[PDB]
Amino acid sequence: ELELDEQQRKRLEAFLTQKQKVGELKDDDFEKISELGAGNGGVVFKVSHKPSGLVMARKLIHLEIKPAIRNQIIRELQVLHECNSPYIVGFYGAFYSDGEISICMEHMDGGSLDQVLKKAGRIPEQILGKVSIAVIKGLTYLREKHKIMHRDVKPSNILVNSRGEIKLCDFGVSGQLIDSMANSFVGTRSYMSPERLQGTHYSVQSDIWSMGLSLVEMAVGRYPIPPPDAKELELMFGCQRPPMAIFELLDYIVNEPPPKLPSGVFSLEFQDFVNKCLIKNPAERADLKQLMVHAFIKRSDAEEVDFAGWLCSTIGLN
Amino acid sequence: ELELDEQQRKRLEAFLTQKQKVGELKDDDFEKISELGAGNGGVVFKVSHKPSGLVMARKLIHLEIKPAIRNQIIRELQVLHECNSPYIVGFYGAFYSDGEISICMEHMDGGSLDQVLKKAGRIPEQILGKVSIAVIKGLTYLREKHKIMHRDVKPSNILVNSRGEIKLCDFGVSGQLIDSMANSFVGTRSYMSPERLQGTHYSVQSDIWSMGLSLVEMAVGRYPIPPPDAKELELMFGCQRPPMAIFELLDYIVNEPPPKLPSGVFSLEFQDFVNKCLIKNPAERADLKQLMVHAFIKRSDAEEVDFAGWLCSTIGLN
Ligand SMILES: Nc1ncnc2c1ncn2[C@@H]1O[C@H](COP(=O)(O)OP(=O)(O)OP(O)(O)=S)[C@@H](O)[C@H]1O
Numbered sequence: 089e090l091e092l093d094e095q096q097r098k099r100l101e102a103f104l105t106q107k108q109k110v111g112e113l114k115d116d117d118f119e120k121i122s123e124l125g126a127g128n129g130g131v132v133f134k135v136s137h138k139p140s141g142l143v144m145a146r147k148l149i150h151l152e153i154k155p156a157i158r159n160q161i162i163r164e165l166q167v168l169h170e171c172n173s174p175y176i177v178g179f180y181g182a183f184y185s186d187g188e189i190s191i192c193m194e195h196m197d198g199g200s201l202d203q204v205l206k207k208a209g210r211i212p213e214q215i216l217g218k219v220s221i222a223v224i225k226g227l228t229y230l231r232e233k234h235k236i237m238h239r240d241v242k243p244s245n246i247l248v249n250s251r252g253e254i255k256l257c258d259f260g261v262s263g264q265l266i267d268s269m270a271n272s273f274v275g276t277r278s279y280m281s282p283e284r285l286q287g288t289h290y291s292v293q294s295d296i297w298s299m300g301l302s303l304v305e306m307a308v309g310r311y312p313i314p315p316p317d318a319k320e321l322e323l324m325f326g327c328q329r330p331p332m333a334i335f336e337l338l339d340y341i342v343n344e345p346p347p348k349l350p351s352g353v354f355s356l357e358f359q360d361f362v363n364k365c366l367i368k369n370p371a372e373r374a375d376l377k378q379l380m381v382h383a384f385i386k387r388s389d390a391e392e393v394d395f396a397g398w399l400c401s402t403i404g405l406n
Numbered sequence: 407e408l409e410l411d412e413q414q415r416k417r418l419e420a421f422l423t424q425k426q427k428v429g430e431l432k433d434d435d436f437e438k439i440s441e442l443g444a445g446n447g448g449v450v451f452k453v454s455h456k457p458s459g460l461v462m463a464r465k466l467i468h469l470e471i472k473p474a475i476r477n478q479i480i481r482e483l484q485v486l487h488e489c490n491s492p493y494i495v496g497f498y499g500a501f502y503s504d505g506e507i508s509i510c511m512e513h514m515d516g517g518s519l520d521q522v523l524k525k526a527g528r529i530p531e532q533i534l535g536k537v538s539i540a541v542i543k544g545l546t547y548l549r550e551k552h553k554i555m556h557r558d559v560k561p562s563n564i565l566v567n568s569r570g571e572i573k574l575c576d577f578g579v580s581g582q583l584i585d586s587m588a589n590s591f592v593g594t595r596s597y598m599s600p601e602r603l604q605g606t607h608y609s610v611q612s613d614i615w616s617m618g619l620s621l622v623e624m625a626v627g628r629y630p631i632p633p634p635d636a637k638e639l640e641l642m643f644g645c646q647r648p649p650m651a652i653f654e655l656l657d658y659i660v661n662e663p664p665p666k667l668p669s670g671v672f673s674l675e676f677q678d679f680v681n682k683c684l685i686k687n688p689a690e691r692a693d694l695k696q697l698m699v700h701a702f703i704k705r706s707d708a709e710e711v712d713f714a715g716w717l718c719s720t721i722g723l724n
């Protein structure tokens with residue numbers, strides 16, 4: 089389940105290979121082709137890197153970095169956003185220029201699943217099965233090798249390509265950066281509690297909920313709170329005042345039953361899978377190991393799904 | 407202990423009075439006098455407001471805000487940074503212009519305690535007694551009326567004035583803002599876990615530790631980790647390879663004994679007070695109510711301390 093198949097191992101070595109061959113990244117070596125999407129602190133562009141001729145994704149975060157910490161922050165960006173997993177998007181490098189931090193990444197040609205959701209209307213179960221595996225494995229990797237974080241996965245944080253790969257975005261860079269800046273000084277210090285430095289406030293559990301929710305979102309084709317009543321259901325699915333504001337949604341999430349998949353239209357194991365994710369008490373909610381052996385995942389792992397053909401057809405790639 | 411004495415009540419009404427009299431805040435109505443200090447996302451200036459003739463502190467956060475969310479963010483800034491407590495710095499208003507969010511505040515003429523620490527060398531116990539009360543009361547207020555947050559108090563977040571008032575800064579605006587931007591969408595949504603929306607991951611306990619540490623810092627006159635060995639002590643206090651890097655400090659904090667006050671030179675009750683704050687297990691660490699009745703605080707509350715005279719003399723005000 090967990091270690092890499094040699095095709096995976098090769099694809100990774102092959103990226104790392106290229107990365108060292110790219111040389112030093114600077115702004116006037118990039119030619120902007122199009123906008124891929126909007127990040128929290130800025131915009132992700134598809135760009136060609138003039139020297140190597142490589143196509144990349146370049147996330148531009150408009151953010152002022154004091155000279156005294158200018159690198160050291162960056163040192164840590166490199167350290168924090170360079171991964172070596174099939175389930176995390178490839179990292180080329182990161183640089184600063186004129187109040188812009190640039191993060192250069194592997195270009196995923198299929199885009200994010202929020203865009204793909206719009207193209208498709210709904211993403212089918214078997215497809216989400218393979219998405220789940222990927223997210224679970226990515227989050228596993230991030231947790232073993234990188235972080236103590238709230239990682240709350242949205243469809244906009246999941247990337248796909250025409251090779252049929254599914255990878256997490258390198259998401260939440262802006263929050264990370266401001267936090268980094270908040271925790272650096274002259275001389276080295278920290279006012280963070282011991283409790284917070286082994287960072288188990290941030291158990292995997294919160295990540296799982298968000299994933300659960302993303303899965304229902306993608307499966308039914310809309311943000312799932314407030315749930316859709318029976319009117320909507322039969323219509324969406326063939327017989328299986330409104331816009332609440334934010335204070336209300338937040339209380340709804342805390343105080344109301346968790347959203348869930350409609351019956352009949354989705355397999356029992358999928359329904360159970362997401363129910364495990366959305367158990368409201370995080371003591372009782374599934375953890376990542378639990379999900380990796382859940383019925384849905386076992387079945388999905390064995391299914392031969394033509395992910396890449398589904399995707400290309402959905403978004404019109406070729 | 408908790409509700410306001412009529413001099414306090416008056417000072418508050420009096421600020422709120424003025425605030426409504428200031429009218430609308432914009433950039434070209436401000437004349438920059440000097441820099442008060444550096445914030446995480448920018449700089450805090452002392453400024454005169456041309457129309458009212460009021461002196462203010464204006465925090466400039468260099469940060470791009472998409473038009474689609476431009477207000478709504480701000481709506482929430484107003485809501486989040488306007489308090490009505492003697493122990494939180496007064497809020498005039500907040501506005502945006504040209505990639506700058508401005509936060510206008512009551513000017514505290516004594517500056518922050520990090521600057522005052524530099525002027526004084528060390529801050530004496532009785533003085534820190536009154537500082538403690540203020541911090542405890544401020545954090546109490548923030549918790550009852552405002553927030554679910556990590557609020558980790560540093561000396562740079564504590565403000566004093568020549569009236570002898572002690573108030574928390576309106577600190578952590580940059581982190582708050584990026585978080586706000588991270589959690590807003592088109593349509594209203596949230597991928598935050600229920601657990602995180604009643605925000606008790608963030609118990610008062612982490613705030614307390616940081617305060618504890620700030621108190622020792624101020625009392626001995628340096629960031630207290632690594633502790634100073636007996637060499638330093640006798641010298642600082644009259645007989646009561648080095649710079650560790652950040653990975654090490656962080657492990658030191660998790661794995662080593664908590665720092666503490668030197669004996670003899672500080673009262674037992676002060677020593678105990680900070681020891682309660684720095685208990686490494688947050689289950690056993692003091693909470694805010696506990697501290698409000700601790701021996702140190704009881705004694706400090708009754709002491710008549712000429713705070714304002716100490717301060718003016720230390721920083722040379724008049
Ligand atoms: N490597 C990539 N290839 C293709 N599209 C990408 C890539 N990385 C990001 N995107 C697109 O850009 C959007 C935002 O990227 P994310 O990494 O999800 O950023 P964010 O977490 O929203 O904001 P940050 O990192 O805090 S500035 C995604 O939803 C995708 O549409």
Ligand SMILES: Nc1ncnc2c1ncn2[C@@H]1O[C@H](COP(=O)(O)OP(=O)(O)OP(O)(O)=S)[C@@H](O)[C@H]1O
Nearest residue numbers: 443445446447450463514518562575577578579580
């Ligand atoms: N109202 C004020 N009066 C006088 N000095 C102030 C005032 N507010 C802030 N300062 C000074 O500016 C410094 C930074 O302000 P803080 O509110 O502590 O900001 P920060 O939390 O470091 O950064 P932010 O809010 O995330 S941009 C303080 O250490 C003080 O020196």
